[PDB]
Design a protein around this ligand. Structure first.
Ligand SMILES: *Cc1c(COP(=O)(O)O)cnc(C)c1O
Ligand SMILES: *Cc1c(COP(=O)(O)O)cnc(C)c1O
Lengths: 398, 398
């Protein structure tokens, strides 16, 4: 036995899953990519409906041009750590873009969204303090809790009442961080942030909201679910990513806290990693600025989402949400085999959606998750609906 | 009080440091960048000697071209998580490049070197198992220990004897990971990997070596200190980064372990973050392939390092190493003020080096750290020596 013997179980179960299906959903490799919404997968022209490219920014001509120009002028990489080795002025500029986008006095960029959550949670809450989070929080949030030395306080999924009860029972004096997500990504439903933030404030807790799945298309300024729900000026920290709507890699936290800059001095995942490459920062900055006024993209994204949600519901698919509340539409299937057969039929027919099954989802939940793009056309969404109807009828789902 | 009151001390001490100097070393911002070795900083043409661009790959014309082409063909970003949302074939290709570079059967790329260490350490060693590491290990290694649930076993810095003693006293049955760094980056000295690996094997431990500071210029194939010391085929895992020699962002782990692929199934920092952008993967792949045969760059890097080390030693500077053992040359100063005055004089005179002082360094250690580039010319290194002599004499160091 050695350090990898602990994975013998995972190896056996993976092999079992792969034997029982055709295409390995964990090893999808695109061959050629035309657009935000079309690629060649397994030799077939395929509509992409399983990516997080919500605002279709990744082929925006200004975004691409900024990236190319940055490569030319500043090269492929960086000096090292921003704090230790210095940085290009582009990093100051992307932080300014985030200040402008969110209307905050503070913005700190990280190498990934994962690291932004890891770093901010583990740095803000120390020994004897509390992080309070939804039981079904994103892995990066749990990992931030694990990295830190605070107490962790789970509350029942989507329960304002349980948040209130659990907070109320904690010792009064120690500082507290309530961490919420605007969009629950599994089913594409939305958190009751207005009510939960009121509860947090009643108990004197600070609030961090992850707005990774809402950027550019929730709220008057596209800031997120918190903005849509009227919470401007009440959220202590907002965490996000560049990897969904913005169209690159990176993470960030924004805040109006007057001591927010001190996070740079203490945050190990910020200090001990190289700064992002010029092309990445340039694409992010250009994209973020365009997202401030991308009303047409936002319009199409929501029209497409509502068309898909309403259309699938009308066909008799069981969806994760009664109304179209985000750009994720989740189709719920009866069992493992049905989910795989449906997913495979869709793929074979020219549509790629995300399949989520246990243990990624709770036992008994088997999903096909559709993530809409601002650059899908109405015709493409109609094609998608037809593909779902055909595959659903063939497999026996509807 | 709130969650940021814990930083009041850091805020006060930072302000004290800034008041006692002129330029803030933690906020160096380059204005214009010409080459791997020259930029405009505070309006002055400045030789760069504080970056980790060891092989000067960041303006390599093939590297830049690959990045630009990837932006054009594949866009600014990715589908999401490789495992959950699929990937472009470029990711398979960079992993293949790493297999070819290191001569291994396994390669896993991560979004950063920090995350590669975080992920691999926390995933390989579980509850009841042991991670054994140098007391002065890199922060990412300690952070990997913190993220995991293993026992941690520090040994006295650079002590083969203490590694042996500490390992020998652990329970025999549980699996064990010894984590070593090839180059100690603070002073630029080298670890006795040959002797330490023999000790690890005597006690049945697996070995992970971080070769972030050696890639392309140690060993017959540029694989690292372990290769230079004849340890090919004896190292279980090698971790590295794209952010130094390769010239972008990213991390990786390579291995010949037959179950290495299982790490993807279990490693949360690999699973729960977006894949790297096309431009980044393309620049990395092109660079890694060129690094396999970059003999001229390697030659210049080492010639430059030896010229600088020997030249500073001859002038009467106290260096961190008796012989030139890496591409980091550390100058040791007597006190905080002397270090800052010297660093400032160098900067004002047109040279940027890294200043490392407590608590980044041990109390009593005050360093100017020079990191050599393959693209420095002999004339530039002579200019540097003259700048050190002038500043050293003016400040009173020599
Ligand atoms: C997408 C997401 C992340 C990860 O962001 P990356 O930039 O891909 O690392 C973390 N937390 C939440 C809630 C997310 O939605
Ligand atoms: C540079 C370095 C890292 C961090 O790599 P990034 O790619 O900058 O995150 C981690 N560990 C060691 C030993 C390093 O040298």
């Amino acid at each position: 036995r050695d350090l990898l013997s602990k994975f013998d179980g995972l190896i056996a179960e993976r092999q079992k899953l792969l034997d029982s299906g055709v295409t390995d959903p964990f090893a999808i490799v695109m061959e050629q990519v035309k657009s935000p919404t079309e690629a060649v997968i397994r030799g077939k022209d395929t509509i992409l409906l399983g990516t997080y490219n919500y605002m279709g920014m990744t082929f925006d001509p200004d975004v691409i041009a900024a990236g190319k120009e940055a490569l030319e002028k500043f090269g492929s990489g960086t000096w090292g750590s921003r704090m230790l080795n210095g940085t290009f002025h582009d990093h100051m500029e992307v932080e300014q873009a985030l200040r402008d986008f969110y209307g905050t006095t503070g913005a700190i960029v990280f190498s990934t969204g994962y690291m932004a959550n890891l770093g901010i949670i583990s740095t803000l809450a120390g020994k004897g303090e509390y992080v309070i989070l939804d039981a079904d929080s994103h892995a990066s949030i749990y990992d931030g809790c694990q990295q830190g030395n605070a107490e962790i306080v789970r509350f029942r999924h989507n329960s304002v009442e349980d948040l209130d009860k659990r907070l109320g029972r904690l010792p009064k004096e120690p500082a507290k961080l309530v961490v919420l997500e605007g969009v629950y990504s599994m089913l594409g439903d939305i958190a009751p942030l207005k009510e939960m933030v009121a509860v947090a404030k009643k108990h004197g807790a600070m609030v961090l909201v992850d707005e990774a799945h809402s950027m550019g298309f929730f709220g008057p300024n596209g800031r997120g679910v918190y903005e849509a729900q009227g919470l401007e000026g009440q959220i202590d920290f907002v965490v996000g990513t560049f990897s969904k709507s913005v169209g690159t890699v990176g993470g960030f936290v924004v805040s109006n806290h007057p001591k927010f800059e001190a996070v740079r001095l203490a945050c190990r995942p910020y200090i001990f990693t190289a700064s992002l490459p010029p092309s990445v920062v340039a694409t992010a900055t250009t994209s973020i600025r365009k997202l401030m006024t991308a009303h047409e993209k936002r319009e199409r994204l929501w029209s497409n989402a509502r068309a898909l949600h309403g259309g699938l519901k009308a066909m008799g698919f069981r969806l994760g949400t009664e109304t179209c509340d985000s750009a994720i539409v989740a189709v719920m299937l009866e069992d493992q085999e049905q989910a795989a057969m449906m997913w495979q039929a869709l793929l074979d027919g020219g549509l790629y959606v995300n399949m989520a099954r246990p243990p990624a989802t709770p036992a008994g939940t088997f999903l096909l998750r559709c993530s809409i793009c601002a650059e899908h056309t109405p015709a493409q969404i109609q094609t998608v609906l037809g593909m779902f109807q055909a595959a659903g009828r063939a497999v026996g789902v509807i």
